[PDB]
Write a protein that binds this ligand. Structure first.
Ligand SMILES: *[C@@H]1O[C@H](CO)[C@@H](O[C@@H]2O[C@H](CO)[C@@H](O[C@@H]3O[C@H](CO[C@H]4O[C@H](CO[C@H]5O[C@H](CO)[C@@H](O)[C@H](O)[C@@H]5O[C@H]5O[C@H](CO)[C@@H](O)[C@H](O)[C@@H]5O)[C@@H](O)[C@H](O[C@H]5O[C@H](CO)[C@@H](O)[C@H](O)[C@@H]5O)[C@@H]4O)[C@@H](O)[C@H](O[C@H]4O[C@H](CO)[C@@H](O)[C@H](O)[C@@H]4O[C@H]4O[C@H](CO)[C@@H](O)[C@H](O)[C@@H]4O[C@H]4O[C@H](CO)[C@@H](O)[C@H](O)[C@@H]4O)[C@@H]3O)[C@H](O)[C@H]2NC(C)=O)[C@H](O)[C@H]1NC(C)=O
Ligand SMILES: *[C@@H]1O[C@H](CO)[C@@H](O[C@@H]2O[C@H](CO)[C@@H](O[C@@H]3O[C@H](CO)[C@@H](O)[C@H](O)[C@@H]3O)[C@H](O)[C@H]2NC(C)=O)[C@H](O)[C@H]1NC(C)=O
Ligand SMILES: *[C@@H]1O[C@H](CO)[C@@H](O[C@@H]2O[C@H](CO)[C@@H](O[C@@H]3O[C@H](CO)[C@@H](O)[C@H](O)[C@@H]3O)[C@H](O)[C@H]2NC(C)=O)[C@H](O)[C@H]1NC(C)=O
Ligand SMILES: *[C@@H]1O[C@H](CO)[C@@H](O[C@@H]2O[C@H](CO)[C@@H](O)[C@H](O)[C@H]2NC(C)=O)[C@H](O)[C@H]1NC(C)=O
Ligand SMILES: CC(=O)[C@H]1CC[C@H]2[C@@H]3CC[C@H]4C[C@H](O)CC[C@]4(C)[C@H]3CC[C@]12C
Ligand SMILES: *[C@@H]1O[C@H](CO)[C@@H](O)[C@H](O)[C@H]1NC(C)=O
Ligand SMILES: *[C@@H]1O[C@H](CO)[C@@H](O)[C@H](O)[C@H]1NC(C)=O
Lengths: 217, 288, 117, 289, 106, 119, 104
């Protein structure tokens, strides 16, 4: 009906290569997560699998419409036509989105230009476990993400109050370990390209003594 | 262990499209393999495949070939890892039979018709297949119309019959157990006064047998029934255990009456090889 | 949205009665159509359902052969025909459509059949 | 002819927006799903996952795809399904699902003349089956398969089974790649999960399993028992033969050790004691008594 | 055939008190138990579709509670027009209803 | 496994050009708009055509129409072995490659240098 | 056993394209990584790699940043399984020396 007219007017004269406020101020992006399951923490490879619902929300004064409907709810058919921040996880050995049955993405454009972009990810993050005190060892190893091409002067990330919210913590594949908590952190790192805003989520794992207690001791 | 088998084939289909009919040039056109993305090609899929791909080096390995009357030929070079559910109750003396079901996905039987071209020379190159373990005994081509809740779809089936060769297993798992039993039999020619020697024999034999058995059973999957090789190993283990318990029976009544001990040792020397040969013969006659 | 059944029937024992259920407000090809009987002062009982898009009809095992359910897509009607009836099925017959979670949200009004002489 | 049908298709897609669900303003889309399990794949006990090959069928009502021609049902190609709106059903617990592309995309689309669509896919879902291995190897599991919508809350897209919920998930007769377990029956259910974004409809399907105790018997219990008997024989030997009884004891104790080690390697690295662990502990205690 | 044992057979209760009805299914029925309210000389009206989901137009004093086999219908402040039969019917398989409970006032 | 620089060269008269340069060392994306032979390895299992970072290919159009088309590719070919002399055996692992869909009447292959000095 | 090693790097290249030169604005433009399909980028390849891939989450991990003087800055996040044969004649008291070769 008229939603087609709105969507056509939003993409008329729209350049998805220029971040919102390209030459005014940095783009503030609020990031939230939802940890479905923290996969097996195999010490041999110093890696661990995690499955999350990464949500990013920012303001885009170009996707600003004025109609009776307050929010536009869309699937992944309009994700490749607007600007989308290039958030990548800096300590991921291999990570990939989900595509069955349809690309697992969500796009919600509010009335004042506020965009919400949500996707499902399975990240094989890396953390060098200091295997001393084994098996009486405790680890707290992170998941770091940041923009790739946009330095601190262009894209600034910022956690929400209630950003990271774990699931049930019972049907996870944490066999030898045990989830005890998490904490979010924001810093600024220096790279050959520029200064980047690096966000981190630290998960605290405590190795329960059972498998090794009955296998070797 | 995965109950599958990988086969590489040149899968060719031939239909008649009246819209691709030309009467200007008299030659059978052969176009680039990229024009197949602009024609209609049947939605053929293998029902029991798990991981397959068209080889893409140096290009996408496909052939499109028109004819002046509309006939279209369309070949691919596929590598399907089809599923092969095996009945291992006779392993390794078993004959397997697993197929390759070729069915059309979207089009019911009132929209498409599958048929082998030649009906006996359709599938070639089977008598040149050299497998390292199995050996193709027979192959059959079938044509059915399966029924799903969305219609009745045509189906072709290509079925092999693989008979497993027994040379490798006779070399690897039967001979070591047989010779370990022969070694266990040595404990009877030693005098019954030797208490360490005979024990050594029976215990080394037992441990060796159990080790071999577990290792061989691991090389295969967690199958819940008793295979033939498992039956042979269990029989060998029973023979070993009986030898050890006959040495123990001799050592029990040795001090009381050594005459009966010597008689039992002779009886064992005579009747362990006989019973083992009888069991071995009935085994190799029940399965072969 | 509005299911209109037929009127009351006074049928002799041993005959066949064909009750009609006209659905106004929707198309019967979208949902199923259940037929329920209720004897006086007793619980509801299922007779059978029909999928008007195909014609697949399922019946209660104790009503198989005795009753048959047909449809008419042009007038959006469901017909229930009792082939051979005794003097015991003097119940009230309701016509219902399946709802959201497979419930029967919209019922008819009931054609109280009567078998006597 | 085929130009009448090309014209019908071009009239269907002329003025169609595949970014808008059918009935965006005054309706909640009703997706009638269905599953046909062609083969229940092998339940990987190490990863606590399981594979299942399905014919995932969906069917909604699109009023923007009504036509009137010689045919009633347009059995179209799988490439038309990318120009219309199709629900984005994702599996809530699937790990790495693949959609088959041999030789063409294994999809289907039948547009009925009144708009009723039908869209089936051929999937190989590798879902997660959390297991409580406290009765190993005498345990029974209920492996779930939850699928719902992404980006469409409950006020927009509601899912529903297409037949009686007891007859929706069908398993083929010969479709059992289970060599270790034993499929007992399916069990479907429909609920609503809250979230930070909205309320979503979630359809659940549990496949009840039951492990077969043959392989574990043969390879752990028998060897364990036979080892206990072989250890117990050392009593009927006379007291003068110390070398022999010593060999018996040591060898049996170390055979029990290696059996415990080999029996624990098959299972996931779990942090409680299974039933087999208790049996092996008691046999170990017996050889040490 | 799944059978639904509905309890009690007939209860009598005064106005303004909490009341509860139970419906135990024989086999498994996930959440496909519906509660219908049939007033005398009228057609049954759906109250609770699925377990614990009020139908459009039903007062908030009706609440469902679901499980695999046991289901409960609780009415809160009971008014004077809630004097009717209350049938519970599963739909996980071919629909089978319960016997119903004749609610009464005293 | 083997890792090769597969060079091919044919003559296309439709690509004659006269300009300031003799040869045109064009990108690897221009080679997707002209005709290129569909060579495949008759006994390959799973070969990859490296495209790191950009597609590893090369196309040189000489001024008289002669094309040069070079690829970098890893071929995982088959090599049936007779192991009766193991571990004192010697093998001859083949690498057969020809055309797909073009018979001998249409496309014939040849070695560019002397057959001894080609591979 | 495979005689190879795996390394993850932030491969970055910098050239000067006189066609992508501007002077009306003073800032260094950082375009979306989808414009790298419309510019010219050098055909750099690693000779001794076996399996390589640019990471693609949440987008294709590459940067393409222009400068007002024409300088183009093109970065990738690669994970190369470079192949390097080892000499184990002094195992395990040995020193391996193996490299990564970058060629046009
Ligand atoms: C070296 O060579 C390598 C091999 O060639 C090469 O890898 C290839 O890279 C390219 C580009 O990066 C990949 O192509 C892209 O893939 C994206 C997603 O990839 C995922 O999915 C594919 C499988 O793709 C199928 O499934 C998706 C999701 O359903 C479909 O969208 C696809 O079209 C495709 O569907 C067909 O096939 C299905 C069967 O699988 C059928 O069921 C279906 O019906 C179709 O027939 C996987 O293979 C990928 O795995 C690989 O990549 C991951 C990356 O992390 C690796 O980890 C992994 O190991 C594998 O390597 C992955 O899982 C596509 O989204 C993308 O298409 C979009 O982008 C292009 C370009 O912008 C658009 O033109 C295109 O239209 C798409 O945009 C539309 O759709 C998106 C949906 O998100 C919208 O958001 C967007 O707005 C737009 O919508 C608009 O257009 C629509 C029509 O297009 C319209 O409907 C809308 O309404 C709207 O108008 C693109 O296809 C390719 O997959 C890689 N292949 C492999 C084997 O890896 C590598 O890059 C090379 N290296 C270098 C350095 O060059
Ligand atoms: C699954 O199989 C289908 C069909 O076999 C594949 O669809 C094909 O995809 C390729 C590339 O995605 C298409 O080629 C493209 O053509 C356009 C012109 O429209 C061109 O601009 C592009 O550069 C590209 O060359 C091809 O047309 C398309 N064919 C069909 C029939 O849809 C699909 O890619 C396969 N997916 C996977 C993951 O293997
Ligand atoms: C391997 O196993 C397959 C699967 O069972 C065998 O296929 C079966 O082959 C027989 C004989 O070719 C078929 O019998 C046919 O039955 C039809 C029924 O109408 C009849 O018309 C034919 O004249 C014939 O009697 C049988 O249907 C078929 N089974 C299936 C499920 O298709 C195959 O024979 C086995 N052997 C080999 C070498 O593959
Ligand atoms: C996640 O990040 C948020 C924001 O950085 C943290 O919230 C802050 O918490 C401190 C101490 O509780 C308060 O003084 C601030 O006012 C909060 N800020 C906001 C914006 O909420 C939160 O503590 C972090 N989560 C952790 C550390 O677990
Ligand atoms: C006296 C004699 O000949 C000895 C030789 C071997 C002995 C058996 C070994 C295995 C034992 C297992 C359990 O300890 C029960 C007793 C058990 C069967 C023993 C009985 C006495 C036997 C037959
Ligand atoms: C085309 O193919 C047919 C059948 O293979 C053959 O008889 C005919 O000679 C071919 N045409 C030419 C020009 O070779
Ligand atoms: C652009 O990059 C150059 C590189 O050194 C730097 O000197 C300059 O300050 C950058 N421009 C801005 C506006 O930061």
């Amino acid at each position: 009906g008229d939603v087609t007219v709105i969507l056509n007017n939003l993409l008329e004269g729209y350049d998805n290569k220029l971040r919102p406020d390209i030459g005014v101020k940095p783009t503030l992006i609020h990031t939230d997560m939802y940890v479905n399951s923290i996969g097996p923490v195999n010490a041999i490879n110093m890696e661990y699998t995690i499955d999350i619902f990464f949500a990013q929300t920012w303001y885009d004064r170009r996707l600003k419409f004025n109609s009776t409907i307050k929010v536009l709810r869309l699937n992944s058919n309009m994700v490749g036509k607007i600007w989308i921040p290039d958030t990548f996880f800096r300590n991921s050995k291999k990570a990939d989105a989900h595509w069955i049955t349809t690309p697992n993405r969500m796009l919600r454009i509010w009335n004042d230009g506020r965009v919400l972009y949500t996707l499902r990810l399975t990240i094989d993050a890396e953390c060098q476990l200091q295997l001393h005190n084994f098996p009486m060892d405790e680890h707290s190893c992170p998941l770091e993400f940041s923009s790739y091409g946009y330095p601190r002067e262009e894209i600034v990330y910022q956690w929400k109050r209630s950003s990271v919210e774990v699931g049930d913590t019972r049907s996870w594949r944490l066999y030898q370990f045990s989830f005890v908590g998490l904490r979010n952190t924001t810093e600024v790192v220096k790279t050959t390209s520029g200064d980047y805003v690096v966000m981190s989520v630290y998960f605290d794992l405590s190795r329960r003594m059972g498998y090794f207690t009955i296998q070797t001791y | 262990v995965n109950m599958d088998y990988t086969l590489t084939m040149y899968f060719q289909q031939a239909w008649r499209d009246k819209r691709l009919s030309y009467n200007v040039i008299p030659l059978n056109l052969t176009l680039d393999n990229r024009v197949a993305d602009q024609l209609w090609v049947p939605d053929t899929y293998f029902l029991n495949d798990k991981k397959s791909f068209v080889h893409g080096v140096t290009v996408k390995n496909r052939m499109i070939r028109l004819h002046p009357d509309g006939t279209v030929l369309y070949g691919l070079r596929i590598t399907t890892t089809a599923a092969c559910m095996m009945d291992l109750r006779r392993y390794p003396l078993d004959e397997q039979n697993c197929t390759l079901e070729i069915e059309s996905y979207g089009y019911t039987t009132d929209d498409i018709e599958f048929y082998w071209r030649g009906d006996d020379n359709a599938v070639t190159g089977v008598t040149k297949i050299e497998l390292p373990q199995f050996s193709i005994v027979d192959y059959k081509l079938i044509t059915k119309k399966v029924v799903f809740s969305t219609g009745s779809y045509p189906r072709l089936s290509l079925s092999f019959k693989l008979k497993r060769n027994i040379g490798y297993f006779i070399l690897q798992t039967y001979m070591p157990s047989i010779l370990i039993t022969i070694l266990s039999w040595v404990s009877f020619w030693i005098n019954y006064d030797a208490s360490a020697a005979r024990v050594a024999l029976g215990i080394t034999t037992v441990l060796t047998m159990t080790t071999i058995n577990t290792h061989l059973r691991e090389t295969l999957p967690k199958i819940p029934y008793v295979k033939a090789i498992d039956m042979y190993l269990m029989g060998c283990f029973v023979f070993v255990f009986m030898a050890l318990l006959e040495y123990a029976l001799v050592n029990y009544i040795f001090f009381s009456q050594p005459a009966r001990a010597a008689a039992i040792d002779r009886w064992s020397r005579i009747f362990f090889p006989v019973v083992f040969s009888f069991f071995n013969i009935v085994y190799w006659l029940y399965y072969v | 949205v509005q299911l209109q059944q037929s009127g009351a029937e006074l049928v002799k024992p041993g005959a066949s009665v064909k009750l009609s259920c006209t659905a106004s407000g929707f198309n019967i090809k979208d949902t199923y159509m259940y037929w329920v009987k209720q004897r006086p002062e007793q619980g509801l009982e299922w007779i059978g359902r029909i999928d008007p898009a195909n014609g697949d009809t399922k019946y209660d095992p104790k009503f198989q052969g005795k009753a048959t359910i047909t449809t008419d897509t042009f007038s959006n009607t469901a017909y229930l025909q009792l082939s051979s009836l005794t003097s015991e099925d003097t119940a009230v017959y309701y016509c219902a459509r399946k709802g959201l979670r497979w419930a029967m949200d919209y019922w008819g009004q009931g054609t109280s059949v009567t078998v006597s002489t | 002819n085929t130009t009448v049908f090309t014209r019908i298709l071009d009239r269907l897609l002329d003025g169609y927006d595949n970014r808008l669900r059918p009935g965006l303003g005054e309706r909640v889309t009703e997706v009638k799903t269905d599953i046909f399990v062609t083969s229940f794949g092998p339940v990987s006990d190490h990863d606590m996952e399981y594979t299942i090959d399905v014919f995932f069928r969906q069917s909604w009502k699109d009023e923007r795809l009504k036509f009137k021609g010689p045919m009633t049902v347009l059995r179209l190609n799988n490439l038309m399904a990318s120009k219309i709106w199709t629900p984005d059903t994702f599996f809530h617990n699937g790990k790495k699902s693949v959609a088959h592309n041999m030789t063409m995309p294994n999809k289907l689309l039948r547009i009925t003349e009144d708009g009723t669509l039908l869209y089936t896919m051929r999937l190989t879902v590798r879902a997660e089956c959390p297991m409580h291995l406290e009765d190993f190897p005498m345990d029974a599991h209920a492996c779930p398969l939850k699928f719902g919508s992404y980006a469409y809350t409950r006020a927009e897209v509601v899912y529903e089974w297409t037949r009686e919920p007891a007859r929706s998930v069908v398993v083929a007769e010969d479709g059992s790649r289970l060599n270790q377990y034993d499929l007992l029956g399916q069990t479907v259910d429909s609920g609503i999960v809250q979230s930070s974004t909205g309320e979503y409809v979630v359809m659940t399907t549990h496949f009840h399993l039951k492990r077969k105790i043959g392989y574990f018997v043969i390879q752990t219990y028998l060897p364990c028992i036979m080892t206990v008997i072989l250890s117990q024989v050392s009593f009927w030997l006379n007291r003068e033969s110390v070398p022999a009884r010593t060999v018996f004891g040591v060898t049996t104790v170390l055979t029990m050790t290696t059996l415990s080690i080999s029996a624990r390697n098959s299972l996931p690295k779990v942090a409680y004691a299974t039933a087999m662990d208790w049996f092996i502990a008691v046999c170990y205690a017996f050889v040490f008594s | 055939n799944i059978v639904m044992t509905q309890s009690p057979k007939s209860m009598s209760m005064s106005v303004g008190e909490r009341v509860t009805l139970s419906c135990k299914a024989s086999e498994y029925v996930g959440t496909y138990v519906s509660w219908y309210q049939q007033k005398p000389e009228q057609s049954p009206k759906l109250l609770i579709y699925g377990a614990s989901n009020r139908y459009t137009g039903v007062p908030d004093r009706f609440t469902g509670s679901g499980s695999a086999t046991d289901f409960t219908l609780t009415i809160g402040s009971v008014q004077a027009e809630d004097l009717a039969d209350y049938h519970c019917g599963q739909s996980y398989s071919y629909p089978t209803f319960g016997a119903g409970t004749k609610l009464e006032l005293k």
